[PDB]
């Protein structure tokens, strides 16, 4: 699943980034003098292409999720095998318990 | 005041009572124990030991009670007079 | 058109459902038949946003049921003839196209479909272009369409569709 | 005795997205292990002087050992209303020994085709989702070789229900539509 | 004009970064142990035995709120409650896997204790028992009292029947859901195996009585206790011989 | 299948209503901030107009930005909470962590009866031959 | 240019189906 991960990951990044680029454009806007031209339009550029690149990896992670966006919630859960375990350690603990407590008792012998 | 909010708290009393015979009749008791007849604030009838596998038990409101203390009344038995489980 | 307007209807209550909770019930009752009916009269009913008052119930002699004559206030679409109404394709055939607008299909004649336009066979998801591919149209698109008239049968109602008109289309 | 109506909706699955619809339907369906059963079907028709031949359907399972053969009679299609959206037929489903095939035999039905079908059986409440790859099979008698019929599955959703009421049609449409994208579940006519 | 839009872009876009650079893999650790599913705004989860069926009508739906997570318990399903069962002769964990194992296990105890109190009301049996209100008391032998109580805490005990007690509706549960169910032949209808193999492989009347037996929780754990005092009786015997 | 249909368009039109929406704003910020010729509006109104319609409009290019953020969460959430493939290859493995302890503990257990049983069979062979006589 | 479309790989086909159903019911292509 770490593909969902990474996916999530590059979208912030991207966000971020042509936020952080719109930002400066805009700052260079009021800028009374404006020295980052050819910058500038290079800046516009990217901020363009991000924001598309976004788009279609929305668009096809969606699609990625209406593969299998059954809405249906999936009943198959794991509680058998948990419950059981659970109950066989809690069995496990009490048989160490009395071990413990016929030990003690051994021990009370011997200390006479 | 107290005439009114006795007769409130009683009700709601009631109210309750008949809910927890319904949730008993529902879950453990099973037609083993029935409800005869409920009067809203008035009284409320449960019968046990039915003749399939009869006997009522009246819980009652009475607008206001000095003289004698208001209590349940268990209306076709008449049970017999033992001590220690009549005040029970 | 969505128009929200008062419907006069009447409910049949069975006796069984007399006692505690009648009147409720009948506002009940009257939810369950009209949604999901419609009349050409009115067009396909959405929902009743409240009940405006709750008549008198009159017996039926020898029936044993009651008239309730109840006033609602609702929202109903109805298509007219001559309007553009915006509407999505639900399925791409070459016989004629087929398209959604909510309760409303609609169904559009290969005739009536613009002549430069001409379906696409060999495309795995059927759909129609054009030569220079200036406009596209495929399923689940945004499209207008003028209503040549308006016809209902088994309270549905489903026109045809007219792409010759000015600024219809995909845009 | 009432009667048993099968209810049936059939669709094919291409074999590359075999894999997707598995896993798909053990999502929506109960938590059970998969039964991976594998099982020869032969058809016993009577050629009478009625023109329809009476068609029973003998299945032996050779994967589950120490099960008893199962004789189904199937019934002509009784579908009507369109809302059901389903296909409806009587169906009469009796255990039977293994010497069932001599008594057909010596009581007349013919052995006319023989399939051997394999894949996965999966169930949610009384609807069952069988997804199997029917095998032809060639030479007079054995399951020893099977050449595949198709390269896709056959899916089908069969609810034996007792024939009281009905909306039986209703809650298999609901289930249908899931696999809707996956795989288009419809009932299609036996007729071509 | 454009110093303040620059200003306010700037911000959020480094607000966005700090809130950028873990309920995410929370939530993920959270589905994994237990099935979760999405409705609404409020992201739901399973919280009982209804896969593993148990009919017990009760939603076990526990809500998942931002606060880096928090799980929402259903009211009546918190505290901690444990089945007590005793013989008188008288008469690393996450935060939310701990709140959710309890709230498991409470409406596991109440599935126990509803099957018991039906059983104890409803079934004819010898020696009868009387359900109080959480507590149920039986005498299987007539210098003996069983008594089976549900305690519920709300925020001479003996082990082995509690435990048993748990394995028992669990092997109620897995007799719903079972492989055994299954038909190999894909003709072959449903039900069980071996009242499949009644037909051809005839079976008398005791086998298909045994097939399909009506007992109930409360008899087997009565019959079970009686075992245990008889046995406990013979060692003592034995003992002071 | 309608309510998959449905929930693809409802996801699909969040996402291009947004990029339509973040691109249309930086459009509207520039078809302004050019400096044009003022008349009769007069700078004293004009130059604060477009001051504060400005910065409404950077506050909702970062409204679309934030709720971009939230619908990816959202699809984050829904391939954890109800992918399908994964999630049954999920439970399948937490199943063999289960069954793998289960087995271990019932060795153990099973172990350590037997060995208990051999000193109960040595006790019980000595406290009974022992011969004390009260 | 937002391109065309993506994912075009059918799961079902029709042809199929229909055979399939022909078998099972008369026997084609088993006989």
Same mark, same amino acid.
């Given at each position: 699943?770490?593909?969902?991960?990474?996916?999530?990951?590059?979208?912030?990044?991207?966000? *971020?980034?042509? *936020?952080?680029?719109?930002?400066?454009?805009? *700052?260079?806007?009021?800028?009374?003098?404006?020295?980052?031209?050819?910058?500038?339009?290079?800046?516009?550029?990217?901020?363009?292409?991000?924001?598309?690149?976004?788009?279609?990896?929305?668009?096809?992670?969606?699609?990625?999720?209406?593969?299998?966006?059954?809405?249906?919630?999936?009943?198959?859960? #794991?509680?058998? #095998?948990?419950?059981?375990?659970?109950?066989?350690?809690?069995?496990?603990?009490?048989?160490?318990?009395?071990? #413990?407590?016929?030990?003690?008792?051994?021990?009370?012998?011997?200390?006479? | 005041?107290?005439?009114?909010?006795?007769?409130?708290?009683?009700?709601?009393?009631?109210?309750?009572?008949?809910? =927890?015979?319904?949730?008993?009749?529902?879950?453990?008791?099973?037609?083993?124990?029935?409800?005869?007849?409920?009067?809203?604030?008035?009284?409320?009838?449960?019968?046990?030991?039915? =003749?399939?596998?009869?006997?009522?038990?009246?819980?009652?409101?009475?607008?206001?009670?000095?003289?004698?203390?208001? =209590?349940?009344?268990?209306?076709?038995?008449?049970?017999?007079?033992?001590?220690?489980?009549?005040?029970? | 058109?969505?128009?929200?307007?008062?419907?006069?209807?009447?409910?049949?209550?069975?006796?069984?459902?007399?006692?505690?909770?009648?009147?409720?019930?009948?506002?009940?009752?009257?939810?369950?038949?009209?949604?999901?009916?419609?009349?050409?009269?009115?067009? %396909?009913?959405?929902?009743?946003?409240?009940?405006?008052?709750?008549?008198?119930?009159?017996?039926?002699?020898?029936? &044993? %049921?009651?008239?309730?004559?109840?006033?609602?206030?609702?929202?109903?679409?109805?298509?007219?003839?001559?309007?553009?109404?915006?509407?999505?394709?639900?399925?791409?055939?070459?016989?004629?196209? %087929?398209?959604?607008?909510?309760?409303?299909?609609?169904?559009?004649?290969?005739?009536?479909?613009?002549?430069?336009?001409?379906?696409?066979?060999?495309?795995?998801?059927?759909?129609?272009?054009?030569?220079?591919?200036?406009?596209?149209?495929?399923?689940?698109?945004?499209?207008?369409?003028?209503?040549?008239?308006?016809?209902?049968?088994?309270?549905?109602?489903?026109?045809? &569709?007219?792409?010759?008109?000015?600024?219809? &289309?995909?845009? | 005795?009432?009667?048993?109506?099968?209810?049936?909706?059939?669709?094919?699955?291409?074999?590359?997205? !075999? $894999?997707?619809?598995?896993?798909?339907?053990?999502? !929506?369906?109960?938590?059970?292990?998969?039964?991976?059963?594998?099982?020869?079907?032969?058809?016993?028709? !009577?050629?009478?002087?009625?023109?329809?031949?009476?068609?029973?359907?003998?299945?032996?399972?050779?994967?589950?050992?120490?099960?008893?053969?199962?004789?189904?009679?199937?019934?002509?299609? $009784?579908?009507?209303?369109?809302?059901?959206?389903?296909?409806?037929?009587?169906?009469?489903?009796?255990?039977?020994?293994?010497?069932?095939?001599?008594?057909?035999? $010596?009581?007349?039905?013919?052995?006319?085709?023989?399939?051997?079908?394999?894949?996965?059986?999966?169930?949610?409440?009384?609807?069952?989702?069988?997804?199997?790859?029917?095998?032809?099979? !060639?030479?007079?008698?054995?399951?020893?070789?099977?050449?595949?019929?198709?390269?896709?599955?056959?899916? $089908?959703?069969?609810?034996?229900?007792?024939?009281?009421?009905?909306?039986?049609?209703?809650?298999?449409?609901?289930?249908?539509?899931?696999?809707?994208?996956?795989?288009?579940?419809?009932?299609?006519?036996?007729?071509? | 004009?454009?110093?303040?839009?620059?200003?306010?872009?700037?911000?959020?876009?480094?607000?966005?970064?700090?809130?950028?650079?873990?309920?995410?893999?929370?939530?993920?650790?959270?589905?994994?142990?237990?099935?979760?599913?999405?409705?609404?705004?409020?992201?739901?989860?399973? /919280?009982?035995?209804?896969?593993?069926?148990?009919?017990?009508?009760?939603?076990?739906?526990?809500?998942?709120?931002?606060?880096?997570?928090?799980?929402?318990?259903?009211?009546?399903?918190?505290?901690?409650?444990?089945?007590?069962?005793?013989?008188?002769?008288?008469?690393?964990?996450?935060?939310?896997?701990?709140?959710?194992?309890?709230?498991?296990?409470?409406?596991?105890?109440?599935?126990?204790?509803?099957?018991?109190?039906?059983?104890?009301?409803?079934?004819?049996?010898?020696?009868?028992?009387?359900?109080?209100?959480?507590?149920?008391?039986?005498?299987?032998?007539?210098?003996?009292?069983?008594?089976?109580?549900?305690?519920?805490?709300?925020?001479?005990?003996?082990?082995?029947?509690?435990?048993?007690?748990?394995?028992?509706?669990?092997?109620?549960?897995?007799?719903?859901?079972?492989?055994?169910?299954?038909?190999?032949?894909?003709?072959?209808?449903?039900?069980?195996?071996?009242?499949?193999?009644?037909?051809?492989?005839?079976?008398?009347?005791?086998?298909?009585?045994? /097939?399909?037996?009506?007992?109930? /929780?409360?008899?087997?754990?009565?019959?079970?206790?009686?075992?245990?005092?008889?046995?406990?009786?013979?060692?003592?015997?034995?003992?002071?011989? | 299948?309608?309510? +998959?249909?449905?929930?693809?368009?409802?996801?699909?039109?969040?996402?291009?209503?947004?990029?339509?929406?973040?691109?249309?704003?930086?459009?509207?910020?520039?078809?302004?901030?050019?400096?044009?010729?003022?008349?009769?509006?007069?700078?004293?109104?004009?130059?604060?107009?477009?001051?504060?319609?400005?910065?409404?409009?950077?506050?909702?290019?970062?409204?679309?930005?934030?709720?971009?953020? +939230?619908?990816?969460?959202?699809?984050?959430?829904?391939?954890?909470?109800?992918?399908?493939?994964?999630?049954?290859?999920?439970?399948?493995?937490?199943?063999?962590?289960?069954?793998?302890?289960?087995?271990?503990?019932?060795? +153990?257990?099973?172990?350590?009866?037997?060995?208990?049983?051999?000193?109960?069979?040595?006790?019980?062979?000595?406290?009974?031959?022992?011969?004390?006589?009260? | 240019?937002?391109?065309?479309?993506?994912?075009?790989?059918?799961?079902?086909?029709?042809?199929?189906?229909?055979?399939?159903?022909?078998?099972?019911?008369?026997?084609?292509?088993?006989?």
């Amino acid at each position: 699943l770490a593909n969902e991960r990474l996916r999530a990951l590059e979208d912030i990044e991207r966000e *971020i980034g042509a *936020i952080l680029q719109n930002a400066g454009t805009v *700052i260079l806007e009021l800028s009374k003098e404006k020295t980052n031209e050819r910058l500038l339009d290079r800046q516009a550029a990217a901020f363009t292409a991000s924001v598309q690149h976004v788009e279609a990896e929305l668009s096809a992670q969606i699609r990625y999720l209406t593969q299998v966006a059954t809405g249906q919630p999936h009943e198959g859960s #794991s509680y058998s #095998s948990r419950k059981d375990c659970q109950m066989a350690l809690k069995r496990v603990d009490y048989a160490r318990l009395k071990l #413990s407590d016929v030990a003690r008792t051994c021990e009370q012998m011997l200390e006479n | 005041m107290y005439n009114c909010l006795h007769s409130f708290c009683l009700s709601l009393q009631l109210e309750v009572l008949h809910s =927890q015979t319904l949730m008993l009749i529902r879950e453990r008791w099973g037609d083993l124990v029935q409800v005869e007849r409920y009067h809203a604030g008035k009284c409320l009838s449960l019968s046990v030991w039915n =003749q399939q596998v009869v006997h009522k038990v009246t819980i009652k409101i009475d607008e206001n009670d000095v003289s004698k203390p208001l =209590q349940i009344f268990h209306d076709p038995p008449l049970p017999a007079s033992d001590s220690k489980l009549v005040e029970r | 058109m969505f128009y929200h307007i008062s419907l006069e209807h009447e409910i049949l209550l069975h006796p069984r459902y007399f006692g505690p909770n009648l009147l409720n019930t009948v506002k009940q009752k009257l939810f369950t038949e009209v949604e999901g009916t419609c009349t050409g009269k009115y067009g %396909f009913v959405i929902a009743v946003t409240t009940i405006d008052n709750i008549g008198a119930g009159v017996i039926q002699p020898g029936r &044993g %049921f009651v008239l309730y004559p109840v006033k609602y206030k609702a929202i109903v679409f109805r298509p007219f003839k001559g309007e553009v109404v915006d509407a999505v394709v639900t399925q791409v055939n070459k016989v004629g196209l %087929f398209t959604e607008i909510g309760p409303m299909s609609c169904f559009i004649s290969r005739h009536s479909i613009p002549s430069e336009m001409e379906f696409d066979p060999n495309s795995n998801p059927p759909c129609y272009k054009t030569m220079d591919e200036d406009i596209v149209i495929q399923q689940d698109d945004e499209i207008r369409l003028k209503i040549v008239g308006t016809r209902v049968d088994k309270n549905d109602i489903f026109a045809i &569709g007219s792409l010759m008109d000015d600024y219809l &289309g995909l845009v | 005795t009432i009667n048993m109506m099968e209810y049936l909706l059939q669709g094919s699955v291409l074999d590359h997205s !075999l $894999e997707s619809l598995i896993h798909r339907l053990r999502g !929506l369906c109960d938590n059970m292990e998969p039964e991976t059963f594998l099982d020869h079907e032969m058809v016993f028709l !009577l050629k009478g002087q009625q023109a329809s031949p009476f068609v029973l359907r003998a299945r032996r399972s050779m994967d589950r050992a120490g099960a008893p053969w199962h004789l189904r009679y199937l019934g002509q299609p $009784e579908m009507g209303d369109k809302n059901r959206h389903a296909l409806v037929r009587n169906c009469v489903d009796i255990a039977t020994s293994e010497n069932l095939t001599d008594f057909l035999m $010596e009581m007349g039905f013919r052995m006319d085709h023989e399939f051997v079908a394999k894949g996965h059986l999966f169930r949610k409440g009384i609807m069952k989702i069988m997804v199997y790859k029917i095998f032809r099979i !060639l030479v007079p008698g054995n399951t020893d070789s099977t050449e595949a019929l198709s390269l896709s599955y056959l899916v $089908e959703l069969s609810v034996v229900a007792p024939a009281g009421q009905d909306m039986v049609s209703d809650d298999m449409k609901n289930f249908a539509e899931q696999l809707k994208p996956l795989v288009h579940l419809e009932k299609i006519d036996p007729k071509r | 004009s454009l110093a303040g839009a620059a200003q306010i872009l700037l911000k959020g876009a480094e607000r966005l970064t700090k809130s950028v650079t873990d309920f995410n893999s929370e939530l993920l650790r959270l589905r994994q142990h237990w099935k979760l599913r999405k409705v609404g705004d409020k992201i739901l989860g399973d /919280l009982s035995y209804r896969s593993a069926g148990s009919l017990f009508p009760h939603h076990g739906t526990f809500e998942v709120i931002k606060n880096p997570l928090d799980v929402q318990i259903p009211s009546d399903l918190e505290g901690s409650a444990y089945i007590k069962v005793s013989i008188q002769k008288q008469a690393g964990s996450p935060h939310w896997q701990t709140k959710l194992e309890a709230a498991q296990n409470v409406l596991l105890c109440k599935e126990i204790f509803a099957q018991l109190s039906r059983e104890a009301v409803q079934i004819k049996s010898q020696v009868p028992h009387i359900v109080v209100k959480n507590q149920i008391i039986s005498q299987p032998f007539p210098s003996l009292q069983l008594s089976i109580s549900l305690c519920h805490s709300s925020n001479d005990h003996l082990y082995v029947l509690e435990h048993n007690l748990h394995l028992l509706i669990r092997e109620f549960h897995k007799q719903t859901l079972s492989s055994i169910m299954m038909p190999h032949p894909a003709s072959a209808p449903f039900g069980h195996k071996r009242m499949r193999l009644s037909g051809p492989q005839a079976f008398d009347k005791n086998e298909i009585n045994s /097939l399909q037996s009506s007992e109930g /929780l409360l008899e087997k754990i009565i019959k079970q206790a009686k075992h245990i005092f008889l046995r406990s009786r013979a060692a003592a015997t034995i003992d002071s011989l | 299948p309608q309510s +998959k249909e449905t929930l693809l368009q409802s996801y699909n039109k969040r996402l291009k209503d947004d990029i339509k929406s973040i691109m249309d704003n930086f459009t509207e910020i520039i078809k302004t901030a050019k400096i044009e010729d003022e008349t009769q509006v007069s700078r004293a109104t004009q130059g604060e107009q477009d001051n504060y319609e400005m910065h409404v409009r950077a506050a909702n290019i970062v409204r679309a930005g934030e709720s971009l953020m +939230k619908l990816v969460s959202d699809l984050k959430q829904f391939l954890i909470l109800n992918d399908f493939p994964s999630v049954n290859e999920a439970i399948d493995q937490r199943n063999q962590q289960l069954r793998t302890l289960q087995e271990e503990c019932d060795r +153990k257990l099973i172990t350590l009866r037997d060995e208990i049983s051999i000193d109960l069979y040595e006790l019980e062979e000595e406290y009974y031959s022992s011969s004390s006589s009260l | 240019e937002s391109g065309g479309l993506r994912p075009n790989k059918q799961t079902f086909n029709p042809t199929d189906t229909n055979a399939l159903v022909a078998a099972v019911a008369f026997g084609k292509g088993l006989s």
